Amino acid sequence: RRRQLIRQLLERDKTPLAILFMAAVVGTLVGLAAVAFDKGVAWLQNQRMGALVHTADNYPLLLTVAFLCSAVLAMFGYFLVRKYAPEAGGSGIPEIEGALEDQRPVRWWRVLPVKFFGGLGTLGGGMVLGREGPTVQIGGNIGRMVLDIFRLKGDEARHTLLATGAAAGLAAAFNAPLAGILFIIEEMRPQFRYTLISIKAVFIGVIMSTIMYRIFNHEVALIDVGKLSDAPLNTLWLYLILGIIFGIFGPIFNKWVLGMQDLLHRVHGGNITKWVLMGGAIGGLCGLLGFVAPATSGGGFNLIPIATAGNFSMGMLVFIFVARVITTLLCFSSGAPGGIFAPMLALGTVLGTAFGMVAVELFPQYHLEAGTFAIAGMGALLAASIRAPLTGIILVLEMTDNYQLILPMIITGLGATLLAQFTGGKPLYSAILARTLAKQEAEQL
Amino acid sequence: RRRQLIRQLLERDKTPLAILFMAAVVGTLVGLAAVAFDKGVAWLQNQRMGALVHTADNYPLLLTVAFLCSAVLAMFGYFLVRKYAPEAGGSGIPEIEGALEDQRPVRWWRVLPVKFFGGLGTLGGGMVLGREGPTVQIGGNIGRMVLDIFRLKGDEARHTLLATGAAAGLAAAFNAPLAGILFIIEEMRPQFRYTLISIKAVFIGVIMSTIMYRIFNHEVALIDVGKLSDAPLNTLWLYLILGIIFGIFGPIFNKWVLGMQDLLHRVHGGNITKWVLMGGAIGGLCGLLGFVAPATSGGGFNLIPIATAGNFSMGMLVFIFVARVITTLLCFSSGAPGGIFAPMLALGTVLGTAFGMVAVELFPQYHLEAGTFAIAGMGALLAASIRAPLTGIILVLEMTDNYQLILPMIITGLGATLLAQFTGGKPLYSAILARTLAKQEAEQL
């Protein structure tokens, strides 16, 4: 009746649906955080371009105010990160991957208003860090936040409301919900047996986060090439030797970054009052090299359609490549709050269009294009330095709408990951986690 | 050595690169078969309209040609689906749900080509069935077709190679790679703990199926309505009344389907040649309704973009498009190889726009349109009668590009499935499985 068995006391199914409602509200807050971060970095880029271009009297006044205007923003990044909490640190994901293994415990209160507000300004300063790192660490720690204001279970909820936030941050970064799930289903979840309700909560968070991304931006994804030509079967074996080159380059890049992150510690170990001066001095360098040569610095997403259509010269490509390598080494590994998973796409597609412009002039009998090798090269650094080839292919197919070259890209992935396994090396994100846990073990006496 | 010990004997890639790559190759097929299904039913619709428009001199000539042109294809559907293999009869998902709990073994060499070659002719032939169910069952049977020809061990591969494919049929039939995974998460998987490689294989199958659907069909999403108004924050309490109305309507429709299943079987005491002549009488009525009342027949993917803009007036709406139950009940309960997924997806929207039109003939202080009440009713019958709300939120957000009104969708879901639970009911795609299992139990001893 109305009084007897009134809704069966919420059908005796509170604990199932409560962990889905928590995943829904964290899927609402992540994504809103992502569009706030994107609007803030676009705002800061627009002011740092407009205030620089509003005077055009001579060169050196502009060249000396750009170095100053990016310096205070990068100093606002470093002086927030190294002073308040170093759990911000590097590229996000190495501080959240061990949080699923219950190391580097994610205290949310000292991460959000420092990572968010610092990585707004220093990514808007024009440096070469990515946009995914702050938003994926913010995504996981909002999950820890909106678990720790409701006081849920001790062990299961601490993982299943952190996974659906670490997935949702990456999903709301690039308008790629499947690369948000595929990624977290891979790299950060090892060989075990996972429950049903948890993987449903991850989909709840990812879909309610990409929906809150697509509300405030209703458009096609961030990078565009323009629906290039078909890749026939006769020319497909050039993608395999491109995979050979990328699988060789992967662990060499890992050794490069693991050496540079310790070299920039050897220059200044502690002593934050000189650390933030080095950070501001390198942010001003990235601002100056972003104004004088706009194809060098920046987030990398201002570089894709001007380089996958065959625009620059080959000497310009071999200059931009050795410039962007020394920029994304010397500005990431210093320790600014910023992603490396995003500019690896640019560093991949530059070599992709380089090998395209070589193979077009070297094989005239194939009617090959130099643009459809750049998209195959974009999802190759994610296969040979992250060793997560699924979410290195699916992210590129969600961002770039060039669906026709799926068959080159699965070949250049499965054909670079096996070569990275054959040449030895680790995923970079697990390597940074193990290298940080070595010092975390050495801290105890 | 150098040539010896190649990747430590290929790093033991018997499991993690073959049961993954076979999920990839079963994803790639459903997307060469699903697109053949779609381009076959579109070609049959174009030919059935071109043969219809050829003679337009007077009514009772082409009205009687329309009485038989759908009827011959109805013979070619029913006689195929009943003389050769009586396992395809039904809308897919109840029969493919049986194989996951290990009942009703899927004879892929005998139930697949009959479903294809006699389901396209009766789905594009002028019926009112859906384009989804005989894609889900074809995607399930393609899994066992690929499995029994590559000879895997039948203990876990016989779930993790047809679960991919059972998801990949829907994911490439509705261009929704999220709802395709969440349908098999919510519907066809019990509370048991699941492994990492099986939850990866469904993802790889779904994405390499939706990619090869988006190769041939480069279209915008399949239901293209205009960008409607945003949902106001004070008018959410009307949508809960819509959820209550649909939750009242849901189990009544499920009892209607199961109560006409035996009433349409009562005119079939065996004698398959009488079933084909009853299916001819089904086909003649649904082909007669093809153009003299053209918004009654069809799959319901051409009635939806017209009925949301307030084009249809109230009288013909309540008199015809709600009496559309008398044909979408008559066509699916008979047993033709078509879906009841889509003609509930397009039956909920006319009841939604009826509630929106009475809401705009009522209190005008909100000054809202009835457009926001049809998108919320499109994916609420899926929650109220199939009781899978987590594919009823996302399907009418993947096909309909109106990403704004995610709040009325959540409100009318949690508020229709919640009422449909304690009002008394059971999900149709699990109830008719037990109904056909009762006959499978009563045939022996």
Side-chain angles (χ1 to χ4, degrees), chain A residues 14-445, chain B residues 13-190 193-445:
Chain A
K14 295 178 168 294
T15 297
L17 264 295
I19 211 160
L20 262 71
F21 172 64
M22 214 83 62
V25 66
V26 74
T28 297
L29 285 177
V30 188
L32 216 62
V35 299
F37 192 76
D38 184 74
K39 186 249 179 194
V41 72
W43 198 58
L44 264 293
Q45 276 166 293
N46 282 287
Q47 273 104 32
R48 88 166 312 264
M49 190 271 287
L52 180 48
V53 75
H54 93 279
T55 76
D57 54 345
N58 51 1
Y59 280 82
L61 179 62
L62 274 73
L63 315 182
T64 41
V65 300
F67 203 97
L68 182 84
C69 76
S70 162
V72 197
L73 308 190
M75 272 187 30
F76 188 89
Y78 281 71
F79 189 77
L80 264 295
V81 178
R82 200 50 69 86
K83 172 70 167 64
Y84 269 31
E87 301 169 12
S91 193
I93 321 191
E95 288 294 326
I96 212 75
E97 187 200 283
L100 268 75
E101 303 318 292
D102 307 307
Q103 290 91 29
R104 318 298 323 280
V106 281
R107 29 176 196 168
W108 85 95
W109 59 83
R110 264 200 170 188
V111 175
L112 273 301
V114 45
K115 168 70 73 75
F116 192 71
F117 282 91
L120 269 193
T122 180
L123 195 62
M127 68 191 191
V128 290
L129 274 300
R131 215 183 82 258
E132 72 93 25
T135 202
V136 63
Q137 193 163 14
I138 274 164
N141 299 144
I142 286 173
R144 187 59 208 273
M145 174 183 206
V146 183
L147 199 77
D148 273 10
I149 54 182
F150 281 68
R151 299 166 321 279
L152 193 40
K153 306 316 188 315
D155 47 49
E156 190 81 44
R158 198 197 203 87
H159 291 189
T160 183
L161 262 295
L162 176 58
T164 183
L170 188 62
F174 302 106
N175 218 322
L178 275 155
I181 304 164
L182 215 332
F183 187 55
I184 268 18
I185 258 59
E186 214 343 65
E187 217 225 317
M188 291 170 57
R189 262 175 155 160
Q191 179 94 2
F192 269 135
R193 286 233 182 220
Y194 300 140
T195 77
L196 176 64
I197 303 100
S198 43
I199 203 66
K200 193 142 60 176
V202 175
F203 305 148
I204 281 292
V206 158
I207 297 154
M208 199 162 194
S209 182
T210 180
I211 276 175
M212 280 264 157
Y213 182 76
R214 280 191 216 172
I215 283 177
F216 287 82
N217 290 113
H218 45 72
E219 58 173 341
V220 179
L222 307 159
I223 60 177
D224 196 354
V225 185
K227 275 87 194 162
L228 283 189
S229 64
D230 190 292
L233 282 170
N234 45 5
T235 175
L236 192 141
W237 64 279
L238 295 181
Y239 297 102
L240 196 146
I241 185 67
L242 187 62
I244 299 293
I245 303 149
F246 273 123
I248 285 178
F249 198 84
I252 302 304
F253 192 77
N254 284 62
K255 296 294 288 306
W256 262 93
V257 59
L258 270 297
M260 194 68 55
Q261 212 271 347
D262 213 317
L263 198 166
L264 274 164
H265 175 77
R266 286 302 149 185
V267 60
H268 282 87
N271 205 7
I272 190 183
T273 187
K274 315 319 179 183
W275 190 244
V276 296
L277 264 293
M278 189 273 291
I282 201 61
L285 189 139
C286 294
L288 179 67
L289 274 74
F291 168 66
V292 185
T296 312
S297 315
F301 296 133
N302 317 337
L303 296 203
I304 318 294
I306 313 169
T308 69
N311 211 0
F312 306 134
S313 46
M314 311 75 87
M316 181 56 72
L317 263 61
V318 72
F319 167 69
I320 287 299
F321 177 55
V322 73
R324 285 194 50 90
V325 165
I326 203 177
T327 320
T328 201
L329 263 293
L330 181 69
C331 202
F332 160 70
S333 296
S334 44
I340 189 177
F341 173 89
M344 274 177 192
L345 305 182
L347 204 55
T349 183
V350 166
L351 293 200
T353 185
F355 192 79
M357 292 179 72
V358 166
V360 163
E361 83 204 14
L362 212 155
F363 297 131
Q365 72 270 56
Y366 271 96
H367 303 285
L368 193 55
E369 196 149 358
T372 175
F373 271 59
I375 295 301
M378 172 183 311
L381 262 292
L382 303 192
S385 160
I386 308 298
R387 220 159 291 153
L390 294 163
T391 178
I393 291 165
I394 313 297
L395 177 82
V396 176
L397 269 306
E398 256 49 58
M399 290 176 69
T400 292
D401 217 38
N402 266 38
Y403 268 117
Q404 291 85 17
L405 58 153
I406 173 63
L407 199 53
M409 196 179 299
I410 182 174
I411 286 299
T412 198
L414 276 302
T417 73
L418 182 84
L419 269 297
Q421 286 279 83
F422 187 77
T423 195
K426 304 136 61 185
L428 161 65
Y429 286 141
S430 178
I432 297 288
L433 170 67
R435 194 200 190 82
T436 316
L437 284 175
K439 300 171 165 54
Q440 202 261 351
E441 287 278 349
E443 278 139 32
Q444 293 94 24
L445 310 178
Chain B
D13 283 348
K14 189 59 183 182
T15 293
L17 220 164
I19 211 163
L20 173 146
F21 197 68
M22 275 188 229
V25 80
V26 76
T28 50
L29 289 176
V30 187
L32 289 201
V35 63
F37 202 50
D38 172 50
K39 296 189 173 187
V41 301
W43 168 65
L44 288 176
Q45 277 171 275
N46 181 83
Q47 277 205 329
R48 200 176 44 87
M49 212 63 49
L52 177 49
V53 73
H54 268 173
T55 61
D57 52 344
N58 49 0
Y59 293 149
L61 273 55
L62 86 170
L63 270 293
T64 57
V65 184
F67 204 18
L68 59 91
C69 62
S70 70
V72 187
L73 273 168
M75 314 315 166
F76 190 72
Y78 276 87
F79 157 71
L80 257 63
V81 80
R82 279 310 302 197
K83 187 91 169 197
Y84 284 170
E87 183 178 2
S91 287
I93 309 169
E95 191 263 330
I96 203 65
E97 195 174 329
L100 288 187
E101 298 163 31
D102 198 2
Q103 287 89 5
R104 307 274 311 273
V106 281
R107 293 185 284 123
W108 54 271
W109 74 103
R110 190 68 270 170
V111 82
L112 191 149
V114 54
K115 173 70 83 175
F116 208 93
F117 214 82
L120 55 92
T122 182
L123 190 51
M127 302 196 57
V128 75
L129 301 173
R131 214 179 56 83
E132 187 262 3
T135 318
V136 179
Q137 184 183 339
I138 283 179
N141 293 137
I142 279 290
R144 275 290 280 184
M145 171 194 187
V146 172
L147 210 57
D148 202 20
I149 201 54
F150 269 58
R151 261 84 185 167
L152 257 288
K153 319 298 162 184
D155 46 9
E156 201 59 42
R158 47 169 51 245
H159 300 158
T160 187
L161 260 293
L162 67 90
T164 172
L170 157 69
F174 277 174
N175 214 322
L178 292 166
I181 309 174
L182 263 171
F183 188 75
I184 204 166
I185 287 303
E186 181 56 40
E187 199 73 31
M188 306 187 266
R189 287 200 145 182
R193 319 189 319 167
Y194 300 142
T195 173
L196 182 74
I197 192 66
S198 168
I199 203 64
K200 201 195 296 179
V202 185
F203 266 92
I204 302 148
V206 160
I207 311 155
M208 310 298 172
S209 172
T210 183
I211 281 178
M212 284 187 179
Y213 179 54
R214 279 206 275 240
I215 294 309
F216 268 21
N217 272 325
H218 49 267
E219 216 175 311
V220 73
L222 199 59
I223 296 176
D224 58 338
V225 287
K227 288 279 199 178
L228 313 177
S229 178
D230 194 306
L233 274 55
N234 45 355
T235 80
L236 269 76
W237 77 272
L238 301 178
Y239 295 104
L240 192 52
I241 290 294
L242 179 64
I244 291 306
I245 287 309
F246 280 163
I248 290 164
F249 189 75
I252 306 300
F253 194 88
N254 278 24
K255 289 168 185 287
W256 264 347
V257 163
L258 302 184
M260 303 305 169
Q261 186 264 334
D262 53 354
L263 261 61
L264 273 297
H265 192 69
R266 273 298 296 272
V267 296
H268 174 270
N271 212 32
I272 321 179
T273 180
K274 290 176 61 182
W275 205 338
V276 308
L277 266 298
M278 207 272 303
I282 296 311
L285 171 142
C286 78
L288 164 59
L289 296 167
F291 71 101
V292 66
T296 301
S297 67
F301 278 166
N302 46 8
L303 189 148
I304 178 65
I306 307 177
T308 58
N311 170 264
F312 284 150
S313 315
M314 156 71 67
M316 61 168 161
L317 179 65
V318 65
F319 276 145
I320 312 300
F321 311 139
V322 187
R324 206 197 173 174
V325 57
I326 215 65
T327 171
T328 190
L329 194 54
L330 190 62
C331 279
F332 158 70
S333 154
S334 82
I340 202 53
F341 210 109
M344 294 201 72
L345 183 53
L347 191 144
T349 175
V350 285
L351 269 302
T353 197
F355 190 44
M357 190 172 287
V358 307
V360 81
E361 264 188 7
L362 264 293
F363 35 87
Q365 48 263 36
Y366 300 134
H367 56 272
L368 80 160
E369 51 182 344
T372 170
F373 271 58
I375 311 297
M378 207 195 309
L381 262 295
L382 302 188
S385 159
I386 303 172
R387 207 167 282 103
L390 200 33
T391 182
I393 303 311
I394 305 165
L395 263 186
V396 304
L397 269 296
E398 285 285 341
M399 288 178 307
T400 287
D401 216 346
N402 274 253
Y403 270 74
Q404 280 104 358
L405 61 157
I406 200 55
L407 272 301
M409 215 67 68
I410 290 298
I411 284 297
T412 202
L414 194 148
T417 183
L418 171 136
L419 186 65
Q421 277 193 354
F422 70 96
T423 323
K426 47 175 64 178
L428 196 144
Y429 279 161
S430 178
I432 192 174
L433 169 67
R435 179 165 307 273
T436 182
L437 208 76
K439 197 158 290 297
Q440 206 80 3
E441 186 264 356
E443 52 91 18
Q444 65 269 50
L445 74 160

